[PDB]
Amino acid sequence: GNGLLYAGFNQDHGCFACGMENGFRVYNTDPLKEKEKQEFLEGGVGHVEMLFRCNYLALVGGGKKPKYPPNKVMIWDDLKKKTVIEIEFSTEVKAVKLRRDRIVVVLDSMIKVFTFTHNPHQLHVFETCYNPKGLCVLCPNSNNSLLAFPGTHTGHVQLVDLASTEKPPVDIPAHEGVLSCIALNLQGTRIATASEKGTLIRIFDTSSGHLIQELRRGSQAANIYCINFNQDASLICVSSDHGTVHIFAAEDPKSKWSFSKFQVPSGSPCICAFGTEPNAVIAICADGSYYKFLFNPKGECIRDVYAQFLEM
Amino acid sequence: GLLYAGFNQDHGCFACGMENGFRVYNTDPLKEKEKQEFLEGGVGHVEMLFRCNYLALVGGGKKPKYPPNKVMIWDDLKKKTVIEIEFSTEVKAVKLRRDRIVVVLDSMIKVFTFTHNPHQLHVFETCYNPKGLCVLCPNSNNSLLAFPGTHTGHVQLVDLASTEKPPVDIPAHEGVLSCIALNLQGTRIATASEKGTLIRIFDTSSGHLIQELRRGSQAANIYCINFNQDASLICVSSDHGTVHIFAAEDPKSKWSFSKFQVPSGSPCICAFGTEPNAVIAICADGSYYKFLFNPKGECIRDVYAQFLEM
Amino acid sequence: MNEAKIAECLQTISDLETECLDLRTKLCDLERANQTLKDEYDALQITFTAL
Amino acid sequence: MNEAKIAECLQTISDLETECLDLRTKLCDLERANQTLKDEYDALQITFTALE
């Protein structure tokens, strides 16, 4: 195909990184610009986690010919163009989440937290239910060390503060069914959740676990691919199968349904985030399509930008 | 009103404490690098950490910005003080390395961690040290601290990485010390007494006398001593603004081969420029001079400026 | 612009310097506590070897 | 040129990143050793208090 194996936004959605069959690439989201491209003749990278706009990337090998064994996490130093820390595991790595002081690795059955040091030390292990999608969010903010992940019970989210791990975790019975997506706002004060039914998105307070807002995307089932907050957490964007994107208002009693939505014309699955304009939403699709949409108060969407980001 | 002038560790810059703040300048070519204004008062000491964002400030002047018994670490990227250390006595000078703050008082030297709460590591007693004579090697692999001992005319040398070893004590002069200088490698220390007739260079590891050099037969107040990059030369300032230039490794040549007068005659500190035959003079009146010498020992004045005015 | 690149880099440097100061501070603070607990281990060890 | 100041800054950032990594390593190393000693203290403590 096009060789894309992974796409993910950074902590503020200002960039997205792509794992490729032949390496990785980093891009500025808005305006779209290729920022870094590292080619590996020897194989692909199946997961890329940025730390904001620092020179550190977490890489996991993947694809038909992975650059690294899939049971290893590689921290890439993009200023030095080399791997500087490696952590090896007994099982495949499903995702990595970075903060400045912690490496969090996500495995199928557990979440291991390490020091971000030349010899990483394991600090914590949290058991999860079967987590093949690697669902985990970690607050990148210095004043909020929140780690959130699927609990051992179906539809529960366990929340742990990594600065006060002696405290019991908050367990949120978020859905009756298997979790499909989890998202934090930039402040780490709100968590958005969906089940495999994908009819409802629920936003909780991360400190109390209380439901703040329930948003109904529809009556029919949908595979939810992505959820993201805007910068002030007043809005969320929601991607679904067939590439539709729904736009809702969070934390507003005047919201329950989508004020806006658009379909991605190619229908390919996409992740979404908000642009630099408060009324901009960006969609990055598995086929390589980039879309920027502007919405209005009537919920009409206009296309501002379209590109194939993989050709730059 | 100029209150203080001092070179950084490589002489590539000099800093000025002013009645209304501080300034940093590039030594050669001369260019104003930074200007910080304080409406509330003066800074009487400014210690650079090379070309880093940290400056040590001590309040001074008629209306000091800070109490003179406090050391302020300035973060020049944030334009604010980030660390404060308070003392029972006035601060005479500060010396910085990346991992240590060294504070010179009139009669003792205290070494601290460079942390938000500095911890006192060592205290060394000195004789009465109103000039704040103290040199600290800035190099990561050499922690040499050198200062006036408790005995008149002695220099004490301490390695801040091996403080359990007995210090080397050098009986450098018969009289009160007036000036002390290290070379960039921290292998040599130059000294003068208040008689100022002799400059003596010692090895810092053994305390052995390497050279005894003569500035003249009559007395003179030595204001400054500095080595060139290879420590093959020293420049020496004295009263009347004369600068003497010596060969440090030639025992056959103990008198200055070259010297020039600073035309204003004001007391000045001196260092070598970027050119191997350049010497720079920073004078208390605000005059800057660059002189080029040649192998015959002739000196010509190349540059003059008021750095306080540009 | 070229100046904009400078501004980002200078901001990165100031934040990095802040972190070194914080780490060194936490390191020196912990070094002292460890030595204090090293001593309470020797003094308590001699007590319970005396018993 | 103004580009030269970019090059200097990039070197400073690279060097600072190494120092952060080294310091956090020494800090986390010591934090773990302190916890190991916090354990042996309480261990020997309760162990020979029962001896008394």
Author numbering:
A (entry chain A): 10 to 263, 282 to 339
B (entry chain B): 12 to 263, 282 to 339
C (entry chain C): 126 to 176
D (entry chain D): 126 to 177
From the paper:
The recruitment of the ATG12~ATG5-ATG16L1 complex by WIPI family proteins is a crucial step in autophagosome formation. As a key autophagic protein, ATG16L1 interacts with ATG12~ATG5 conjugate through its N-terminal ATG5-binding domain (ATG5BD), and further assembles into the hetero-hexameric E3-like ATG16L1 complex, utilizing its dimeric coiled-coil domain. Structurally, both WIPI3 and WIPI2 are mainly composed of a seven-bladed WD40 domain that contains a highly conserved “L/FRRG” motif to sense PI3P and a unique loop connecting the two outermost β-strands of blade 6 for membrane binding. Here, we uncover that WIPI3 can directly interact with the coiled-coil domain of ATG16L1.
However, we managed to obtain good crystals that diffracted to 2.77 Å resolution using the WIPI3Δ/ATG16L1(124–188) complex. In the final complex structural model, each asymmetric unit contains two WIPI3 molecules and one ATG16L1(124–188) dimer, which assemble into a unique 2:2 stoichiometric hetero-tetramer. As anticipated, two ATG16L1(124–188) molecules mainly form two continuous α-helices and wrap around each other, forming a parallel coiled-coil dimer. Two WIPI3 molecules in the hetero-tetramer complex adopt highly similar seven-bladed β-propeller architectures, akin to that of the apo-form yeast Hsv2, and symmetrically bind to the N-terminal opposite homo-dimeric interfaces of ATG16L1(124–188), each burying ~598 Å2 surface area. Further comprehensive structural analysis uncovered that the molecular interface between WIPI3Δ and the dimeric ATG16L1 is primarily constituted by residues from blades 2 and 3 of WIPI3, through a combination of polar and hydrophobic interactions. In particular, the negatively charged E142 residue from one helical ATG16L1 chain and E144 from another chain of the ATG16L1 dimer couple with the positively charged R109 residue of WIPI3 to form charge–charge interactions and hydrogen bonds. In addition, the side chains of R149 and T150 residues of ATG16L1 form hydrogen bonds with F125 and H127 residues of WIPI3, respectively. Concurrently, the hydrophobic side chain of ATG16L1 L146 occupies the hydrophobic groove formed by the side chains of Y65, I94, F125, and H127 residues from WIPI3. Moreover, the methyl groups of T124 and T126 from WIPI3 form hydrophobic contacts with the hydrophobic side chain of C153 of ATG16L1. The specific interactions between WIPI3 and ATG16L1, as observed in the WIPI3Δ/ATG16L1 complex structure, were further validated using SEC-based assays. In accordance with the aforementioned structural data, individual point mutations of key residues involved in the binding interface of the WIPI3Δ/ATG16L1 complex, either from WIPI3 or ATG16L1, such as the Y65Q, disease-associated R109Q, and T126R mutations of WIPI3, or the E142R, E144R, and L146Q mutations of ATG16L1(78–206), all resulted in a significant reduction or a complete loss of the specific interaction between WIPI3Δ and ATG16L1(78–206).
